[PDB]
């Protein structure tokens, strides 16, 4: 309470109207403080019309239901988030500590930690929105930020709360996120987890490059390629991991260390969380041993903790760590350090890690059964008995990573592409969703265009998607700019948010600026841009071959014209 008490007192005093201690609260692993009272999805008509066959598809239908109400916020909360991860064994705790140290040193070999700024935060906020904008322009916002910073320098914290008249707390939230960005932003802003700096990371590489990266790993001699899912990663982050993560502060300057120390000790290793629940109230809870997913640095810190954990699993697999070692309070460091120094970077290059998502090609398949450390650390795998060996892949094109798998294509001119793919229903289902309500047909059309153009660059190889994309582009006016973002994914670089010729953009991404494309001959026509094989298009969810799809394909200009006539008397272009 000596840390969180000051934040507890302010929310108490602010909402003392309806403040109380409800003894029928469902919080067993979280510490509960109090509560107070406070106040399906919409469909993209343009995309829907132009994808009629997928009206009668379960996965598309399922994606047309969002559970953003407080009913759903508690539904999945207690299952994973209200649980305790047992403390790792002394040996495991030492190994992690050594590895973390070694890893932090390796990452900061060239780069240097530094504070991010008001100007950077401002620049990002503006470009993103293209309400927080209003707060950034407000000078009194930044004055409040300074106030809290002085508290943070003093080791205290007053207003930094986390969420799972209104502008007051809205400023407090945004201000709290800036202070994080200030202290820990550099990890993201200076690209510490770029593949060049991290070896295993893929920050700033982009979806289009991920397939090429995995193919490169497959060339590395060793065992199979393992991509194990962790059950609720952010919930499995221990107190120990947080102690390992903060070791980064050792490379910071005094004034920067100072601020980062506060962020770690006061908002990560302790956290006062707001969570909404029907009875409609807001419960105030706190704990020390999990990740605040909405916070800044999360991706960076997950990537780090995962990199470490996999190196440790690799060590176990290689027979460096035994059961006895993990149990040992007085485990010797020599063999670990030796391993890290001689083989560490090599073993990092065998991995592609983005947050809790990982792919690993160990030197052999002992890794598959090396599960002592992995389970002991807390990173228990999803939907598989704790001690059952992992299922690896012998073809990199089967390996799942960042919600995708990847295909190697052969173009008509002999050159080879490597493209991202996933079930066609997931892509179409997502496209048919529009965000929120009160959207005009123009705004609805431009989102459809955004999605249509994303498919042109990333999923062009899917026959149905290319057809649907050309249909949407035909039905939507030419000079209308794609507005709202198609995804929040960190791997999306948003090359489709443009009114430039998509074949020109395609050429830029896949030929021109593609390090793996040696011959830079321009592809002059979409006829030269390849698809997957028919059978693999079908295996990944295509409806090519079905009558209904042939009907849809045959009757598509009629539907385009209907959308055109409802949009109005504008300038359209045909892409059929």
Q: Which residues of the shown chain bind ligand 6CJ in the complex (CB under 6 A)?
A: 188, 293-294, 296-300, 488
Element containing residue 434 per DSSP (H, E): strand 433-434
Q: Is 174 in the site for Zn ion (CB under 5 A)?
A: no
Minimum distance of ligand 6CJ from residue 83's CB (angstroms): 18
Total binding residues toward Zn ion, as defined by CB under 5 A? 5
Residue 549, SS3 per DSSP: helix
Q: Encoding tokens for residue 459?
A: 């999923």
Helices 139-153 & 166-184 angle (0-180, nearest 10)? 60
Is the sign of the CA dihedral 128, 232, 370, 342 positive or negative?
positive
Annotate 322-387 with three-state secondary structure: CHHHHHCCCCCCHHHHHHHHHHHHHHHHCEEEECCEEEECCCCHHHHCCCHHHHHHCCCECCCCCC
Interface with Zn ion (CB under 5 A), residue from 540, 556, 563, 567: 540
Interface segment toward Zn ion; rule CB under 5 A; list 104-112, 153-161, 353-361, 411-419: 153-161
Q: Is 421 in the site for Zn ion (CB under 5 A)?
A: yes
**Nearest Cα to 18, choosing from 286, 287, 285, 283?**
283
Q: Is residue 202 within 8 Å of residue 354, measured between CB atoms?
A: yes
Minimum distance of ligand 6CJ from residue 117's CB (angstroms): 16
When the beta carbons of 232 and 297 are compared against ligand 6CJ, the nearer one is 297
**Nearest Cα to 376, choosing from 83, 84, 80, 92?**
92
When the beta carbons of 297 and 392 are compared against ligand 6CJ, the nearer one is 297
Q: Which does 157 bind (CB under 5 to 8 A by kind): ligand 6CJ, Zn ion, none?
A: Zn ion
Q: Which does 188 bind (CB under 5 to 8 A by kind): Zn ion, ligand 6CJ, none?
A: ligand 6CJ
Minimum distance of ligand 6CJ from residue 107's CB (angstroms): 15
Task: Compute φ and ψ for 91, nearest 5 degrees.
Answer: -60, -45
Residue with tokens 């200009």, as numbered in its chain:
557
Minimum distance of ligand 6CJ from residue 483's CB (angstroms): 14
Q: Which does 300 bind (CB under 5 to 8 A by kind): ligand 6CJ, Zn ion, none?
A: ligand 6CJ
Q: Is 157 in the site for Zn ion (CB under 5 A)?
A: yes
When the beta carbons of 223 and 300 are compared against ligand 6CJ, the nearer one is 300
Binding mask 249-288 for Zn ion (x = CB under 5 A): ----------------------------------------
Was 160 annotated as part of a binding site? Answer: yes
Angle at 12 between CA 7 and CA 15, to 5 degrees: 125
Binding mask 90-129 for Zn ion (x = CB under 5 A): ----------------------------------------
Minimum distance of Zn ion from residue 334's CB (angstroms): 42
Minimum distance of ligand 6CJ from residue 284's CB (angstroms): 19
Minimum distance of ligand 6CJ from residue 300's CB (angstroms): 6
- Cα–Cα distance, 78 to 97 (Å, whole number): 30
Was 208 annotated as part of a binding site? Answer: no
* Adjacent-strand bridge partners of 281: 37, 277
Minimum distance of ligand 6CJ from residue 377's CB (angstroms): 22
Was 446 annotated as part of a binding site? Answer: no
When the beta carbons of 129 and 566 are compared against ligand 6CJ, the nearer one is 129
Angle at 334 between CA 328 and CA 335, to 5 degrees: 80
Was 148 annotated as part of a binding site? Answer: yes
Was 180 annotated as part of a binding site? Answer: no
Q: Which does 298 bind (CB under 5 to 8 A by kind): ligand 6CJ, Zn ion, none?
A: ligand 6CJ
Produce one character per residue of 361-392: b if its CB has 16 or more CB atoms within 10 Å, e if not: bbbebebbebbbbbbbbbbbbeeeeeeeebeb
383 Ramachandran zone, left/alpha/beta (phi>0; psi -120 to 50): left
- Cα–Cα distance, 34 to 286 (Å, whole number): 11
Minimum distance of ligand 6CJ from residue 73's CB (angstroms): 11
Q: Which does 540 bind (CB under 5 to 8 A by kind): Zn ion, ligand 6CJ, none?
A: Zn ion
When the beta carbons of 269 and 375 are compared against ligand 6CJ, the nearer one is 269
Element containing residue 3 per DSSP (H, E): none
Q: Which does 297 bind (CB under 5 to 8 A by kind): ligand 6CJ, Zn ion, none?
A: ligand 6CJ
Q: Which residue ranges are tagged as binding site for Zn(2+)?
A: 148, 152, 157, 160, 405, 421, 540
Residues making contact with Zn ion (CB under 5 A): 148, 157, 160, 421, 540
């Amino acid at each position: 309470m000596d840390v969180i008490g000051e934040r507890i007192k302010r929310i108490k005093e602010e909402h003392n109207s309806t403040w109380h201690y409800d003894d029928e609260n469902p919080y067993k692993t979280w510490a509960y403080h109090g509560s107070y009272e406070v106040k399906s999805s919409m469909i993209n008509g343009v995309v829907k019309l132009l994808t009629k066959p997928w009206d009668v598809v379960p996965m598309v239908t399922q994606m047309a239901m969002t559970d953003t109400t407080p009913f759903g916020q508690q539904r999945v909360f207690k299952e994973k988030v209200d649980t305790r991860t047992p403390r790792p064994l002394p040996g495991t705790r030492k190994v992690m500590e050594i590895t973390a140290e070694w890893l932090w040193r390796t990452l900061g070999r060239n780069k240097r930690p530094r504070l991010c700024t008001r100007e950077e935060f401002t620049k990002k906020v503006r470009t993103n929105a293209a309400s927080a904008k209003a707060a950034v322009e407000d000078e009194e916002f930044w004055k409040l930020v300074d106030r809290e910073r002085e508290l943070h320098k003093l080791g205290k914290c007053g207003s930094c709360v986390y969420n799972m008249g209104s502008r007051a707390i809205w400023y407090m939230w945004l201000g709290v996120r800036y202070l994080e960005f200030e202290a820990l932003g550099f990890l993201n802003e200076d690209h510490w987890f770029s593949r060049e700096n991290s070896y295993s990371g893929v920050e700033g590489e982009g979806l289009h490059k991920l397939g090429y990266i995995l193919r490169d790993i497959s060339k590395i001699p060793g065992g199979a390629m393992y991509a194990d899912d962790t059950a609720g990663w952010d919930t499995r982050i221990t107190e120990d991991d947080l102690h390992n993560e903060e070791k980064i502060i050792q490379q910071m300057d005094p004034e920067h260390r100072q601020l980062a120390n506060a962020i770690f000790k006061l908002t990560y290793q302790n956290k006062v969380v707001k969570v909404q629940r029907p009875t409609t109230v807001m419960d105030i809870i706190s704990r020390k041993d999990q990740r605040g997913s909405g916070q800044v640095g999360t991706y960076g810190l997950n990537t780090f903790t995962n990199m470490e954990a996999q190196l440790v699993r690799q060590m176990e697999g290689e027979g460096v760590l035994t059961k006895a070692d993990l149990e040992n309070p007085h485990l010797l460091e020599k063999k670990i350090t030796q391993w890290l120094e001689t083989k560490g970077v090599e073993r990092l290059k065998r991995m592609a890690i983005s947050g809790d998502d990982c792919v690993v090609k160990p030197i052999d398949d002992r890794f598959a059964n090396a599960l002592l450390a992995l389970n002991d650390m807390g990173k228990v795998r999803k939907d598989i008995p704790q001690w059952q060996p992992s299922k690896g892949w012998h073809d990199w094109q089967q390996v799942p990573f960042c919600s995708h798998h990847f295909h190697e294509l052969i173009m008509k001119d002999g050159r080879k592409l490597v493209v991202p793919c996933r079930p066609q229903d997931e892509l179409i289902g997502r496209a048919r969703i529009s965000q929120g309500a009160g959207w005009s047909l123009r705004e609805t059309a431009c989102l459809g265009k955004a999605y249509a153009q994303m498919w042109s660059l990333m999923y062009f190889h899917r026959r149905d998607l290319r057809l649907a994309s050309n249909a949407i582009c035909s039905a939507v006016p030419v000079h209308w700019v794609p507005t709202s973002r198609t995804t929040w994914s960190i791997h999306a670089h948003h090359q489709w948010m443009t009114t430039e010729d998509m074949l020109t953009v395609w050429n830029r991404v896949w030929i021109e600026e593609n390090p793996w494309m040696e011959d830079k001959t321009p592809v002059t026509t979409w006829e030269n841009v390849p698809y997957l094989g028919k059978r693999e298009d079908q295996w990944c969810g295509s409806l090519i071959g079905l009558t209904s799809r042939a009907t849809w394909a045959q009757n598509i200009p009629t539907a385009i014209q209907q959308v055109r006539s409802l949009i109005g008397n504008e300038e359209f272009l045909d892409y059929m």
